[PDB]
Every structure is written in C-alpha cells, then in structure tokens.
Write an enzyme that holds these catalytic residues in place. Structure first.
Site, mmCIF file in Angstrom:
data_model
loop_
_atom_site.group_PDB
_atom_site.id
_atom_site.type_symbol
_atom_site.label_atom_id
_atom_site.label_comp_id
_atom_site.label_asym_id
_atom_site.label_seq_id
_atom_site.Cartn_x
_atom_site.Cartn_y
_atom_site.Cartn_z
ATOM 1 N N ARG A 257 38.613 42.849 46.074
ATOM 2 C CA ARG A 257 37.438 43.496 45.475
ATOM 3 C C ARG A 257 37.905 44.737 44.765
ATOM 4 N NH1 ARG A 257 34.198 39.084 46.035
ATOM 5 N NH2 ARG A 257 32.237 39.498 47.174
ATOM 6 N N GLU A 286 33.110 47.064 38.248
ATOM 7 C CA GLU A 286 32.675 45.748 37.760
ATOM 8 C C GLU A 286 31.151 45.739 37.526
ATOM 9 O OE1 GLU A 286 33.215 41.549 39.323
ATOM 10 O OE2 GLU A 286 35.111 42.506 39.944
ATOM 11 N N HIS A 304 36.880 38.293 36.669
ATOM 12 C CA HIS A 304 36.586 37.842 38.034
ATOM 13 C C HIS A 304 36.509 36.306 38.180
ATOM 14 C CE1 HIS A 304 35.572 37.987 42.147
ATOM 15 N NE2 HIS A 304 34.693 38.971 42.148
HETATM 16 N N1 NAD Z 1 38.970 36.835 43.149
HETATM 17 C C1 NAD Z 1 37.907 36.181 43.654
HETATM 18 O O1 NAD Z 1 36.920 35.598 42.817
HETATM 19 C C2 NAD Z 1 37.711 36.048 45.150
HETATM 20 C C3 NAD Z 1 36.930 34.993 45.626
HETATM 21 C C4 NAD Z 1 36.657 34.901 46.988
HETATM 22 C C5 NAD Z 1 37.166 35.865 47.866
HETATM 23 N N2 NAD Z 1 37.947 36.911 47.408
HETATM 24 C C6 NAD Z 1 38.466 37.949 48.351
HETATM 25 O O2 NAD Z 1 39.459 37.585 49.316
HETATM 26 C C7 NAD Z 1 39.489 38.612 50.313
HETATM 27 C C8 NAD Z 1 39.691 38.128 51.750
HETATM 28 O O3 NAD Z 1 40.424 36.923 51.885
HETATM 29 P P1 NAD Z 1 39.718 35.598 52.499
HETATM 30 O O4 NAD Z 1 38.267 35.902 52.673
HETATM 31 O O5 NAD Z 1 40.078 34.454 51.652
HETATM 32 O O6 NAD Z 1 40.430 35.162 53.905
HETATM 33 P P2 NAD Z 1 40.014 35.677 55.380
HETATM 34 O O7 NAD Z 1 38.547 35.628 55.591
HETATM 35 O O8 NAD Z 1 40.669 34.895 56.502
HETATM 36 O O9 NAD Z 1 40.479 37.207 55.149
HETATM 37 C C9 NAD Z 1 40.505 38.212 56.144
HETATM 38 C C10 NAD Z 1 41.971 38.503 56.497
HETATM 39 O O10 NAD Z 1 42.365 39.832 56.188
HETATM 40 C C11 NAD Z 1 42.703 40.555 57.356
HETATM 41 N N3 NAD Z 1 41.868 41.773 57.373
HETATM 42 C C12 NAD Z 1 40.579 41.834 57.876
HETATM 43 N N4 NAD Z 1 40.114 43.096 57.734
HETATM 44 C C13 NAD Z 1 41.079 43.843 57.136
HETATM 45 C C14 NAD Z 1 41.097 45.185 56.783
HETATM 46 N N5 NAD Z 1 40.147 45.989 57.272
HETATM 47 N N6 NAD Z 1 42.238 45.706 56.203
HETATM 48 C C15 NAD Z 1 43.344 44.897 55.974
HETATM 49 N N7 NAD Z 1 43.315 43.557 56.335
HETATM 50 C C16 NAD Z 1 42.196 43.035 56.909
HETATM 51 C C17 NAD Z 1 42.350 39.671 58.547
HETATM 52 O O11 NAD Z 1 43.312 39.673 59.577
HETATM 53 C C18 NAD Z 1 42.244 38.282 57.981
HETATM 54 O O12 NAD Z 1 43.475 37.627 58.181
HETATM 55 C C19 NAD Z 1 38.137 39.308 50.236
HETATM 56 O O13 NAD Z 1 38.194 40.608 49.686
HETATM 57 C C20 NAD Z 1 37.353 38.478 49.256
HETATM 58 O O14 NAD Z 1 36.325 39.231 48.632
HETATM 59 C C21 NAD Z 1 38.200 37.014 46.057
#
Ligand code: NAD
Ligand code: NAD
Lengths: 345, 346
Positions: A257, A286, A304
């Site tokens: 994000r 954004e 995005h």
């Molecule tokens: N570019 C895009 O269009 C797009 C699309 C979907 C998701 N995302 C982003 O991906 C990111 C998360 O990945 P995910 O949802 O695929 O997998 P996920 O749900 O398993 O991600 C969470 C992971 O990050 C770690 N984590 C949790 N809290 C944390 C924090 N406070 N600080 C550091 N690490 C932390 C956790 O251990 C866990 O392994 C989110 O920010 C989400 O918004 C981006």
C-alpha cells in the site's frame, strides 16, 4: 423459507455467468442503486431495501460510492444482516469492529490475486534492475538519437537480478510467490524480515535467511520488496532511517500500500543517489502519483494493477458467492473470514 | 619463444582487470592504434605489427574503424594468425567465410547475455499479458482521473500468464532460459518450433512440446516468443500468414532481430485486433522505432536492451580472453566458435 435477501453494492457479476445465475436462483439479489455515501445512509434509515441478510461486493472498484463503511453508516444496517462478502484483501474502507459488534460476519477475498500481484512485483524488480522504464520512454520518443544515447546510457547501470539479494519486507502469501520467482526464476538470493518466521519448508525451499530488524534487511539488500498488510503500525514503515541503512545504488519496489513508504523520504533517497531506481505499483496519495517521481529518470510507476487480472476477478466472484452460499444455505463456515467469526445458518 | 603475440582491436579491458593482467602476462598484446580501414590494410601490408597469432576485440563497439572485415582486408593478415575472438553475438562487419579461407579460427561471445536477454523477454511477456506499458503511461500523466480510468480499462483484457501457452519460435540457449522462467516461474505452457529437436533431458524439464510448422505454432500460442538468428531464411519470417494463423486476441514478443517480424504485418494484426498486444525490444527500422506502434496503447517498446547488462559485458571480456588462452596455450578448442572449427596448439 425460502430465499434470503442479498444487497449488491454496484455491479452484477461479469465473469462467472452460470454461478451468478445459480446465485440469483437461490437468493433475492437487491441492487443497491448507489449514488452518494449520504444518499445510501438515507436509504438505510428509510428501510428502503427492507430486511436483508447479506451484502455482496463483487469487485474492489464496485460500490465505492457507499464509502466509508464507518460506524455511523453501519449504525443503520438492518439487524437481519448476517454476512458481508467483499472482493479484495484490503478493506481499509470498512470499520470491521463496528460491523462485528452487530453480530455481522465479514469475508474478504484473500488469495485471489496472489498470482497476479506477485507477477507485477516480478515485473517491477525486472524494471528497476534493467532500467526498462527509462528505456520505454526513450523508445516512445520515436527519435533515432535518443534511442542510441539511451541504449548506451543504460549499459553503465543495468544489472541482472541473478546473484543479487532481494530483501523481503514481509513474507506472507504474495511475497512467497514473488520470492519463489525471483529466487528460482531469476536467480536472486533471499533475506527477509517478518513478524513471524516461515516454516522449515519455505525457508529451505527459497533459501530464505531471516534477519531481526528492518535496518538489517535494508543493509543486506540490492533490491527491497515491500509486501505488508497496511495499518497504523505499517504507515511510513519505510522512511528515512530505512533509506539511510540501504546500500548506495540499491533499489526498491512496492506492491503493498502506498503510504507504507514515505513518499518524501523515497524522493529524497533517489535525488541523493542512495537509490538507483524505484518501482511503485501503489502511491501514498493514490490516485495522485508523485509529480516528482514521474519527473525522474529511473522510477517505474503503475496504476495499481497488481491484482488487476481477469483470473483474479474470476476468483473474487467465485469466493464472494461461495461464501454467502456456504454461510446462509449450507451451514458451512466462511472460506475467507476476517475479524470475528460467527455461526453459519 | 614464449608469449604468442595478440593484436588488440580498439580499447583494452574495462571490467575484468585481473584477468586482463594475467592475459598480458601470458601474451604480447599489441595495440592496433586504428586510424581508418584503408589505414589498417596499409599497416598490415607494411608488416607494422609483425607476425601475430590472435586478434582480440573486447567490446562490440571497439575497433569499428577497421570495418569492414572484407576479403580484401583479410588478404593482408600475417600468415601466422590462427584465431580471432570477438565480443558480440553478431558479426555483420565480418566476412566469416573469407576469414576461414585463410585458416583463421573465429569465436564470438555466444551465451554471454543468456541471462540478460531471457530476463528482458520475460519482462516483455509480463508486459503484454498485463498491459503494463499502457499502465505506465497512464501513471505519468499524473492526472488522478487517467489513473482510475486506465486502472479500470486494463481490467477488461489483462491476464495472468499462468496456464497460458508460450509458443517458442526457435528454442536455442536464450529461449531455453525464457521457457524455463516462463514455465516454472510463471506457470505458462510451452510448445516450440525449431529446425533441430531438443533432447529428452530438456523437453522433459521444460515440459516442451514440439510442432512442425510456423502455422501450427501460431495456432497453439497464447503468446509468441520470437528468438531466432537473423539471416536470409529468417527475414520477415513472421509475416501476414503467421498473424493470420494466430488465435484472436493473442500476443507476441521479439528479442531476436528487428526484421524477423514484418513491421507492417504486425501493425495490421494489431489494428485488426487479431493481436491484443506486443512487445518489441528490436525494431525493423532500428534505430527508428515504428511511429504507428508508438501511438498504440498495447505495444511495449524498448531500445534494444536485451543483452545490455553490466554482467553481459563482464562475460564478453571473459570469453574473448579465455578463448584465446585455450586455443593457443592450453591445446583446447574454442568455447564459442562460429564458422569453420580448427585444431588448437599449446
Ligand atoms: N498491488 C496490489 O494490487 C495488491 C493486491 C492485493 C494485495 N496487496 C498487498 O499485499 C500485502 C500483504 O500480502 P498478502 O495479503 O498477500 O499475504 P498475507 O495476508 O499472508 O500477508 C501478511 C504477511 O505479512 C506479515 N505481516 C503482518 N503484519 C505485518 C506488519 N505489521 N509488519 C510487517 N509484516 C507483517 C505476516 O507475517 C504475514 O506473513 C498487503 O499490503 C496488501 O494490501 C497488493
Ligand atoms: N535483444 C538483444 O540485446 C540480443 C542479445 C542477445 C541475443 N539476441 C538474439 O538472439 C538470437 C539468437 O538466439 P541465441 O543467442 O539463443 O542463439 P541460438 O543459436 O542458440 O538461437 C537460435 C536457435 O534457433 C534455431 N534456428 C536457427 N535458425 C532458425 C530458423 N531459421 N528458423 C527456426 N529456428 C532456427 C537454432 O536451432 C537455435 O536453437 C539472435 O537473433 C540474436 O540477435 C538479441
């Protein structure tokens, strides 16, 4: 009974035609006819849709005119409401605690965009290693001299990702795919920082080497991949201290994000030469991209599109309909729950 | 006595200093100090450098003052020359058959940019499945509305490469790295078309499925990867007939050479909507990129940066120096011959 009533925010389905028809078999789908946030709260106060048991949101960009889903609007939902299912992983627009206090179960669409998002991130890493962004701008000038000057200029700075270290900030599901493609496809090495450790298998499969702090991770990295959930605690997680700890002429990509990285810090580290190049698929302000980043040579910026792939949508639609189906007609629990977990009907 | 004599074409080594030291060391390295082509012909006639046994050319752009390497130039070389090793894959500037008519072995730098060029193709493949090029231009307007409209507009057509078919035109060293990355990286499927088959060990690894003609390959492909040498046989190889046989809404990427794909057949196919998108690193009229291609939303274009990575150039120098050491001091044959192969010496 016989047909529970589902409120749909924005569009009907665009991809799973049969499943959507079965869904409309099965439930009375009420179109929300969204206009304004205020107009929709008026509608709710007037019992305009009647009692309804579920809310379905079939796409991330669907239903936005209802935002925000804050306490105040949630205070007006009919008490018949049992379950809300939404496309997406992020639900920044939603007060999940105000929704759970009313005994309403929530489900997002976690997992659906893994392949998509990890690919875009792989695209970014490629882009910041090879300076492909600057290359494309040069090509698109249609100018012979520019094409040649740039083809040569890039040769002083481009590197194969292979043998260079990818520093993963977060090692969740999308970063596991990102890693696996950089490690096994592109030949990079992996060090990661994360709130919790990967299992024996993931580490021994990716050659993951964990470190304790972000500074350590920064220090070790040739390119950093930010992939963390967004919250107060992750706001400006990547800031000046972090860029000060990175190596001269390193790289960073963001698909998590926008505000997870301080735009001002970032800009400062590119200008100073600390970063050679950066790649952002998300922006702190954004839909406003940084005018300063654009203005720079080596910064890849995209609209995005991380999860933006048709297969992802197939899955947003599958999971939302399946969740409601399971939770209201099958007595099964939600497949992709978030926040407090309630009992099925 | 010791130290064979090597003519250095253009500049000395720029990246592998310690290898270049040992080379220099092993060999009497004589700088050509090039002036012009005729000028080099005349130095050769006068015996200006004395007999030498090798020429080394350490960068694609070094020694161009000597071009062309034509029969008339080659005919003045010392009879002591056994080998010429050069940076680059191409050698348009060289008459290879003539060099060979004089018992001179030739070596280029094949494979030096396998990593670079495969990665750049994968990038382009990502770009034409996801319409990222379009998305980039949309971002750089810095107009909030453009951002959202294009965000939404890309959602109508973008696709994961996963499960789709990559049709390999040519399956040499670069494509094999491309397939590897596309297959086990992205989860794409691979069909291929090549004048030579590839072995069990390869096809089983890449799950590679061979077809017999271009027309076939065009029909089985979700994305076409073009990667063939550029010659007589391969000029305009991808033509109107090829685009005619391609699935509606398919895609194509070129990392080989500009004219292997007819720029005009490509424009048409794109315009008909037979092609969704395409990615070009190389252009028919290089360095002039198609101005029609440029105006199209769904066409990715780069300035021939396939092999342009610092590591590639590190390896040009490794190979050129190692090629001459093997052939002259180690009794071993070249690592990367091109043309007639000759016996070494030690
Ligand atoms: N570019 C895009 O269009 C797009 C699309 C979907 C998701 N995302 C982003 O991906 C990111 C998360 O990945 P995910 O949802 O695929 O997998 P996920 O749900 O398993 O991600 C969470 C992971 O990050 C770690 N984590 C949790 N809290 C944390 C924090 N406070 N600080 C550091 N690490 C932390 C956790 O251990 C866990 O392994 C989110 O920010 C989400 O918004 C981006
Ligand atoms: N974009 C760049 O910066 C750049 C960099 C390096 C290489 N390249 C290009 O890669 C191409 C060569 O590939 P490579 O380096 O892997 O060498 P290669 O010889 O290994 O590739 C050629 C492959 O195609 C097959 N082949 C030869 N002629 C064919 C034909 N007429 N029709 C179908 N198949 C044919 C051969 O069996 C071989 O397997 C060249 O065009 C070269 O310019 C471009």
């Amino acid at each position: 009974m016989p047909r529970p009533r589902v409120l749909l925010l924005g569009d009907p389905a665009r991809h799973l035609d049969d499943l959507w028809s079965d869904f409309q078999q099965k439930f009375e789908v009420i179109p929300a006819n969204l206009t304004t946030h205020d107009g929709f709260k008026q509608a709710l106060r007037e019992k305009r849709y009647g009692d309804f048991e579920a809310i379905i949101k079939l796409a991330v960009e669907n239903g936005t005119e209802s935002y925000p889903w804050n306490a105040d609007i949630i205070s007006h939902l009919p008490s018949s409401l049992k379950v809300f299912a939404a496309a997406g992983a992020g639900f920044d627009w939603l007060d999940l605690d105000a929704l759970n206090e009313r005994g309403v179960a929530f489900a997002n669409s976690r997992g659906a965009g893994d392949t998509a998002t990890s690919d875009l991130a792989l695209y970014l890493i490629l882009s910041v290693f090879r300076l492909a962004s600057y290359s494309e701008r040069a090509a698109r000038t249609g100018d012979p001299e520019t094409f040649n000057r740039v083809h040569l200029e890039i040769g002083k700075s481009a590197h194969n990702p292979r043998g260079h270290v990818l520093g993963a900030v977060g090692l969740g599901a999308i970063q596991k795919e990102i890693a696996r493609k950089a490690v096994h496809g592109l030949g990079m090495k992996l060090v990661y920082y994360d709130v919790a450790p990967a299992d024996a298998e993931t580490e021994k499969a990716l050659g993951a080497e964990r470190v304790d702090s972000l500074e350590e991770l920064a220090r070790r990295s040739d390119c950093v991949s930010v992939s963390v959930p967004y919250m107060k605690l992750t706001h400006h997680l990547i800031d000046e201290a972090f860029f000060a700890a990175m190596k001269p002429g390193s790289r960073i990509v963001n698909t998590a994000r926008g505000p997870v990285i301080s735009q001002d810090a970032l800009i400062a580290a590119l200008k100073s030469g600390k970063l050679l190049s950066a790649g952002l698929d998300v922006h702190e302000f954004e839909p406003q991209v940084s005018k300063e980043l654009i203005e720079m040579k080596h910064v890849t910026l995209t609209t995005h599109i991380g999860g933006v792939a048709i297969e992802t949508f197939h899955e947003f639609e599958r999971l939302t309909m399946t969740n409601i189906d399971r939770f209201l007609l099958q007595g099964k629990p939600l497949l992709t729950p978030a926040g407090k977990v309630f009992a099925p009907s």
